[PDB]
Ligand binder design. Structure first.
Ligand SMILES: *Cc1c[nH]c(=O)[nH]c1=O
Ligand SMILES: [Ca+2]
Lengths: 265, 201, 98, 244
């Protein structure tokens, strides 16, 4: 089984524009949204069909109550941060927690916070400590690390509960998450050689150019892996052609355990 | 689907060590709590475990094994004030508490100088009851309920005279029957051979 | 405060051929904060029936969105994507390259 | 800093009667809960309030309703009392919910007895019995015994008073009441308590001993139709003096 991950995000805005939610929470399995909640709807709803069909209404009712409490806690924490920063206006507070189940069977776990889109506090579940970026975060670090039981709780949830939730969701949407659609790869000229792939899933793909069997990463332009809108993805990579000398250029694409080579005549 | 199990009752001697077990079968695990609840009072938080190992807090220590799904609350150097119910609770995947039925811990006091006796208390002019007191016996003695429907016998009760640092067990029996006598009131119990029965009249 | 300007990429779902039904995508990513306005343009006019995914979150705390509409590319019609953000003095227009 | 305050401590109810249990916390907590405790089983959640402005059902919501009136208060409502709702109700609170290691802070508890008929409600008979002279000469100690008998339900609080002041040292009261007729489900109760003092203290003729039992029974709005006296909430006591 390939590498998979489960993550939950939280967004808090202090003085939002009218109509924009004060609080938003979204969960993901890989790049797939699975759950959503905001301060406007005040309801936790599935964002994937295989989540809605495998979780009874009692699951969504329970976490609706929890998110309503977590929404208020996020509001109190953001109010504390902005007061200690002596900042006026609207500012953002973000949270990210999750885990990965790698291909070899090993696991990772992470939990971190952000203020105005920049790292604020980062949790280390091995040393059981919080990394603070400034003195406002240093104050929060002191209060959180005085609650040793909460640090141990976060270590257990990241290493045990998160991985267990991930395996559960992986089985729910195995027809989506564990399928493989190979890419359609082509090469055209535009002077640079553009190697383009599309129609592939999972989105993880490695595209590069080789000049006479040697990879020169400095002169390769890499395009982003973009969603096509139908569940598949597309990407590209270009390299500049030497007008003074001919060379043996070949595009190399690796996707889901299969390697591809497109030699340019 | 989710189950918590702890023994109904445990009896130990004052000054000894007792270990109260709690096994759980839950869908996920977010921590195990231990609570103390004295009779007629509110539960109070004792300990929390979420990772494997042993945590100490005074005379109390709590252990947890996630793989075996079992925890114990260890009470060392038992005192009479440790007599209470001890509740174990587990948070599941959805952070809901599943509570055990509770374990009632009974502590037998250490009676240094046992002086078992059955005394006849004085009658009250406002009551037709005759009252007898079985007292000062060792903690190994059990007080049996009455087999006569018109004789009432209460269980043993540990009293502490703090001024003299003195403890004693006692049970009360009473009735308004004509044939009721303190010499026969506790006949259905196994009382010590040397029980002092002061003479009547 | 560090505000990050959106990265705008306009592309089609499939390789586009004239007269064949396709989907015009505008993938806006990497911006912060989350307030943003996105419009798809056909010959400079705002396309009415335009869909978009929900606000999405990235590991670096930036956000991303996908705006799309169904269309049939012709030789004369040009397409673009207009995005406004707090990091932009005026709306930025990115045209479909094809 | 009072913690969790819930009222009332005791309440007798007739089947179909309405009742509201109050609960307040001054710890600035966000999550509040209502539990019922029954013999032989663990605490069961009735309703809970994860935060101010939201409530949801627990494990046993049928027959109850709640209202998170504000951040401090969380009331439990019994609209039509049923005999199965005879229980001890505990209200608790925590800083947040879904936090993991956060513990609960419980209120003192509310004992409830719901009865089809109030005609089996009885105040206790209270009598004091003076120490045995044989005990005094044998042990140099003196044990007084107080008997509270024939009361129902088990809503009683017994206390000893020596010279106008309540005492606790040298006092032991039965942790559980005694069913006078153990085979009957609505049996009246008996309760015994002892006060043991030194023989010197008992032999002072000025020392005054009194055992007082606070009984929680009916109130003015409770309908009474029996020939005997209405068993209202009352204090029944008996006394004894030291003997030289
Ligand atoms: C569903 C849910 C669970 N955990 C989180 O941190 N967020 C959520 O929205
Ligand atoms: Ca209900």
């Amino acid at each position: 089984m390939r590498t998979h991950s489960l993550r939950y995000f939280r967004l808090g805005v202090s003085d939002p524009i009218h109509g924009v939610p004060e609080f938003i929470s979204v969960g993901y399995v890989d790049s797939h949204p699975i759950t959503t909640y905001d301060s406007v709807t005040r309801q936790k709803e599935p964002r994937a069909p295989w989540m809605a069909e495998n979780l009874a209404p009692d699951h969504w009712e329970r976490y609706t109550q929890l998110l309503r409490g977590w929404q208020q806690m996020f509001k109190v924490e953001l109010k504390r941060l902005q007061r200690h920063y002596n900042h006026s206006g609207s500012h953002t507070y973000q949270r990210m927690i999750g885990c990965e189940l790698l291909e070899d069977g090993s696991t990772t776990g992470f939990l971190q916070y952000a203020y105005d889109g920049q790292d604020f506090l980062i949790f280390n579940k091995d040393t059981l400590s919080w990394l603070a970026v400034d003195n406002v975060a240093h104050t929060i670090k002191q209060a959180w690390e005085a609650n040793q039981h909460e640090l141990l709780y976060q270590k257990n949830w990241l290493e045990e509960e998160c991985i267990a939730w991930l395996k559960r969701f992986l089985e729910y949407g195995k027809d989506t998450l564990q399928r493989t659609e190979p890419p359609l790869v082509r090469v055209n000229r535009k002077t640079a050689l553009f190697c383009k792939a599309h129609g592939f899933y999972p989105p993880e793909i490695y595209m590069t150019w080789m000049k006479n069997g040697e990879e020169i990463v400095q002169e390769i332009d890499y395009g982003d892996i973009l969603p096509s809108g139908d569940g598949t993805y597309q990407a590209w990579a270009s390299i500049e052609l030497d007008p003074q000398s001919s060379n043996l250029y070949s595009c190399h694409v690796e996707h889901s355990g299969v390697h591809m080579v497109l030699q340019v005549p | 689907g989710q189950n918590i199990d702890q023994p109904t009752e445990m009896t130990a001697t004052e000054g000894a060590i007792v270990q109260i077990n709690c096994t759980y079968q839950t869908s996920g695990f977010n921590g195990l709590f231990w609570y103390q609840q004295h009779a007629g009072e509110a539960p109070t938080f004792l300990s929390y475990n979420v990772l494997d190992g042993l945590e100490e807090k005074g005379r109390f220590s709590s252990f947890l094994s996630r793989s075996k799904g079992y925890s114990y609350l260890l009470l060392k150097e038992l005192q009479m004030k440790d007599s209470a119910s001890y509740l174990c609770a587990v948070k599941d995947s959805n952070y809901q508490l599943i509570w055990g039925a509770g374990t009632k811990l009974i502590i037998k006091p250490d009676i240094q100088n046992p002086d078992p006796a059955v005394y006849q208390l004085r009658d009250s002019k406002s009551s037709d009851k005759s009252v007898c007191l079985f007292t000062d016996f060792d903690s190994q003695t059990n007080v049996s309920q009455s087999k006569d429907s018109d004789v009432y016998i209460t269980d043993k009760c540990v009293l502490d005279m703090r001024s003299m640092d003195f403890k004693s067990n006692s049970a009360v029996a009473w009735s308004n029957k004509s044939d009721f006598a303190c010499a026969n009131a506790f006949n259905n119990s196994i009382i010590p051979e040397d029980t002092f029965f002061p003479s009547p009249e | 405060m560090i505000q990050r300007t959106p990265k705008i990429q306009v592309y089609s779902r499939h390789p586009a051929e004239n007269g064949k039904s396709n989907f015009l995508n505008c993938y806006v990513s990497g911006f912060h904060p989350s307030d943003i306005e996105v419009d798809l343009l056909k010959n400079g006019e705002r396309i009415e029936k335009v869909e978009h995914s929900d606000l999405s979150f990235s590991k670096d705390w930036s956000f991303y969105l996908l705006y799309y509409t169904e269309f049939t590319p012709t030789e004369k019609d040009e397409y673009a994507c207009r995005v406004n953000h707090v990091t932009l003095s005026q709306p930025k227009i990115v045209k479909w390259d094809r | 800093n009072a913690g969790v305050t819930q009222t009332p401590k005791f309440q007798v109810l007739k089947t179909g009667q309405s009742m509201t249990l109050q609960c307040a916390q001054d710890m600035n907590h966000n999550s509040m809960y209502w539990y019922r405790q029954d013999p032989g089983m663990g605490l069961r959640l009735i309703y809970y309030s994860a935060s101010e402005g939201t409530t949801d059902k627990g494990e046993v919501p049928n027959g109850y309703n709640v209202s998170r009136l504000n951040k401090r208060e969380f009331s439990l409502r019994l609209e039509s009392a049923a005999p199965s709702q005879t229980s001890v109700y505990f209200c608790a609170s925590s800083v947040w919910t879904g936090e993991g290691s956060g513990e609960l802070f419980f209120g003192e508890g509310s004992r409830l007895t719901v009865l089809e008929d109030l005609k089996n409600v009885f105040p206790p008979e209270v009598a004091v019995f003076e120490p045995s002279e044989a005990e005094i000469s044998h042990t140099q100690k003196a044990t007084l015994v107080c008997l509270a008998t024939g009361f129902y339900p088990d809503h009683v609080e017994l206390s000893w008073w020596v010279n106008g002041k309540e005492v606790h040292s040298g006092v032991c009261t039965d942790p559980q009441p005694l069913k006078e007729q153990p085979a009957l489900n609505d049996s009246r109760y008996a309760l015994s308590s002892r006060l043991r003092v030194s023989a010197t203290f008992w032999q002072n003729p000025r020392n005054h001993f009194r055992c007082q039992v606070q009984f929680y029974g009916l109130s003015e709005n409770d309908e009474w139709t029996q020939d005997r006296a209405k068993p209202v909430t009352q204090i029944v006591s008996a006394e004894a003096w030291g003997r030289a």
